[PDB]
Amino acid sequence: GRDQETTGFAWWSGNARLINLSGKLLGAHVAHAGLIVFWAGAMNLFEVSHFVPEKPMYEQGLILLPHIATLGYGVGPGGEIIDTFPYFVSGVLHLISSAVLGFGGVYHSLIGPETLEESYPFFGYVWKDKNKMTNILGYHLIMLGLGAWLLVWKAMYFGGVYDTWAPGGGDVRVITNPTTNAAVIFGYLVKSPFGGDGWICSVDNMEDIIGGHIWIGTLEILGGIWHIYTTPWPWARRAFVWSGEAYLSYSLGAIGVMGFIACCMSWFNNTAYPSEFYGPTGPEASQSQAFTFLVRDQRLGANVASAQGPTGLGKYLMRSPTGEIIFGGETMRFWDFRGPWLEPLRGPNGLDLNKLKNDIQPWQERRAAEYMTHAPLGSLNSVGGVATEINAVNFVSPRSWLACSHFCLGFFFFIGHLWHAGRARAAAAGFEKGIDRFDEPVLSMRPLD
């Protein structure tokens, strides 16, 4: 092990004693991967064991199974779960794989050499050695590109991902014409993050998703080769801190942003996160309620078209500021919502009361009714309900869990970026420990006021 007397780092900063220990650092990272793979496998098998075919996955508080279901495994027409053995296979595979990674980490943390540069030059690396650092980034960049292409392969081959917008009903579909038009693929990137544009969260077609992964997959592999055969340019070296903590701070900041984006994706996107498995989105639940009553009242004998509300802005239907006909009520804020159950009734100009008056299919109703009841609203003790509700329902939208968890994760990792980045910059300057007590810069600065 190590002691503070020889490192200057206390036990609460012990892992910081592994910065220059390449061999030990390898074991630490490899081991941590084992933990991640372990949970993926363990929790998956736990979910499979606690899964029941009489209830939707979202009602069973399952988060991992929805991911496999979206990949198009053990799912059928309407999102109905045919079998769960595929899910069991995934858990078993990850769990056993975690053992291999665990052994490697333990070895590279005990028997393995504390450093590798002395023995294995290829693995041997020193922070600041930009060339080597860029090469390492390249290798991992290629790996991520291959992973994205594996998804693209599963979409156009080896079966297909589940398409909630599939024609004549939602089910797994083999993407055959993935969007490769740069304008469409990169359009999302330049889209405003505000309402309507929804930036990249707006992606509603699997064709763009698979096509976008095609673009990112290629660029990452090409970028890896570039970083493998190129060294940072003068401008970069003069505008970046070359240190392990600095490199970590860059990753911390990036992963923190990715966390926030993932939170929004799980809360707004319904394509990449099928509402059939992940449950309805906040906007989806609201629109579903308006549709549920609109249908019920219309059947009772109410003209939803000319039904003035208390404010006079239409009880069931109204016009979006843009002009599109939208459901009335506070759901006006979610007028930009788009779901496979509501699209058929829509048309060039907002909703089509013709479809609403006649052509409303029973499933369009049943689905909306189910979504309305299973809204994302919930409590920490898992007491399902808008609020001020009695303890009767035990359900919290999986979307809520992912959105809340990843948001908090992103926030902390951003704070970690600020901590590591600032310390890295201060370390480079040399004032990380504190003031010289003899070269205090302020004492040499202008007396200001």
Ligand X SMILES: CC1=C(/C=C/C(C)=C/C=C/C(C)=C/C=C/C=C(C)/C=C/C=C(C)/C=C/C2=C(C)CCCC2(C)C)C(C)(C)CCC1
Ligand Y SMILES: CCCCCCCCCCCCCCCCCC(=O)OC[C@H](CO[C@@H]1O[C@H](CO)[C@H](O)[C@H](O)[C@H]1O)OC(=O)CCCCCCCCCCCCCCCCC
State which residue, 20 or 308, has the beta carbon closest to other proteins.
308
The site map against ligand DGD for 180-209 (x = CB under 6 A) is -------------xxxx-xx-xxxx-----
Query: How many other CB atoms sit within 10 Å of the CB of residue 379?
Result: 15
State which residue, 433 or 446, has the beta carbon closest to ligand CLA.
433
**Residue 39 sits in the site that holds ligand X (CB under 6 A):** no
253 binds, among Cl ion, ligand Y, ligand CLA, none (CB under 5 to 8 A by kind): none
| 318 three-class SS | strand
Q: Which two tokens stand for residue 366?
A: 């049943």
The DSSP annotation for 79-108 comes to G----SHHHHHHHHHHHHHHHHHHHHHHHT
State how far the Cα of 197 lies from the Cα of 187, in Å rounded to an integer: 10
In the chain, what is the straight-line distance between the N-terminal and C-terminal CA atoms, in Å? 52
Site for ligand CLA in 93-152 (CB under 6 A): 100-104, 106-107, 109-110, 112-113, 116, 120, 123, 134, 137, 141
The site map against ligand CLA for 235-254 (x = CB under 6 A) is -x-----------x---x--
330 binds, among ligand X, ligand CLA, Cl ion, none (CB under 5 to 8 A by kind): Cl ion
Give alpha helix (H) positions in 71-205: 85-107, 130-156, 182-190
State which residue, 138 or 178, has the beta carbon closest to ligand DGD.
178
State how far the Cα of 437 lies from the Cα of 433, in Å rounded to an integer: 12
**Residue 330 sits in the site that holds Cl ion (CB under 5 A):** yes
Phi, psi dihedrals of residue 351, rounded to the nearest 5°:
-80, 160
Q: Which of 145, 329, 339, 376 binds ligand DGD (CB under 6 A)?
A: 339
Query: How many other CB atoms sit within 10 Å of the CB of residue 143?
Result: 12
Site for ligand CLA in 394-423 (CB under 6 A): 412-413, 415-416, 419
| 361 three-class SS | coil
Q: Which of 129, 297, 336, 365 binds ligand DGD (CB under 6 A)?
A: 336
CA dihedral 326, 329, 333, 339 (to 10 degrees): -50
Say if CB 285 and CB 83 are below 8 A apart.
Answer: no
Number of residues binding to ligand Y, judged by CB under 6 A: 8
Residues 6+ apart with CB under 8 A from 223: 138, 141
Site for ligand Y in 254-273 (CB under 6 A): 257, 260-261
Phi, psi dihedrals of residue 67, rounded to the nearest 5°:
-60, -50
**Residue 106 sits in the site that holds ligand X (CB under 6 A):** yes
Helix (H) or strand (E) holding 326: strand 325-327
45 class by beta-carbon count within 10 Å (0-12 exposed, 13-18 middle, 19+ buried): middle
Site for ligand Y in 198-217 (CB under 6 A): 199
Phi, psi dihedrals of residue 270, rounded to the nearest 5°:
-120, -15
92 binds, among other proteins, ligand X, ligand Y, none (CB under 5 to 8 A by kind): ligand X
**Residue 215 sits in the site that holds ligand X (CB under 6 A):** yes
Length of the chain: 449
State how far the Cα of 179 lies from the Cα of 157, in Å rounded to an integer: 16
89 binds, among other proteins, ligand Y, ligand CLA, none (CB under 5 to 8 A by kind): none
432 belongs to an annotated ligand binding site: no
Stretch that binds Cl ion, among 61-69, 98-106, 296-304, 321-329 (CB under 5 A): 321-329
Please report how close the Cβ of residue 60 comes to other proteins at its closest, in angstroms.
10
State how far the Cα of 118 lies from the Cα of 112, in Å rounded to an integer: 13
Q: Which residue's CB atom is positioned nearest to ligand X? A: 212
HSE value, Cβ hemisphere, 13 Å, CA-based, for 285:
19
Phi, psi dihedrals of residue 191, rounded to the nearest 5°:
-65, 140
Token pair 């309620």 is at which residue? 289
Residues 6+ apart with CB under 8 A from 156: 174, 175, 176, 178, 210
**Residue 346 sits in the site that holds ligand DGD (CB under 6 A):** no
State which residue, 103 or 412, has the beta carbon closest to ligand Y.
412
**Residue 239 sits in the site that holds ligand X (CB under 6 A):** yes
Applying CB under 6 A, which residues contact ligand Y?
Answer: 190, 192-193, 197, 199, 257, 260-261
Applying CB under 6 A, which residues contact ligand CLA?
Answer: 1-2, 11-18, 21, 24, 26-28, 30-32, 100-104, 106-107, 109-110, 112-113, 116, 120, 123, 134, 137, 141, 219-220, 222-223, 226-227, 230, 232-233, 236, 248, 252, 412-413, 415-416, 419
Applying CB under 6 A, which residues contact ligand X?
Answer: 31, 34-35, 38, 45, 92, 95-96, 98-99, 102, 105-106, 109, 185, 188-189, 200, 203, 208-209, 212-213, 215-216, 239-240
Applying CB under 6 A, which residues contact ligand DGD?
Answer: 59-61, 193-196, 198-199, 201-204, 260-261, 263-264, 268-271, 336-339, 380, 382, 394-396, 401, 404-405, 408
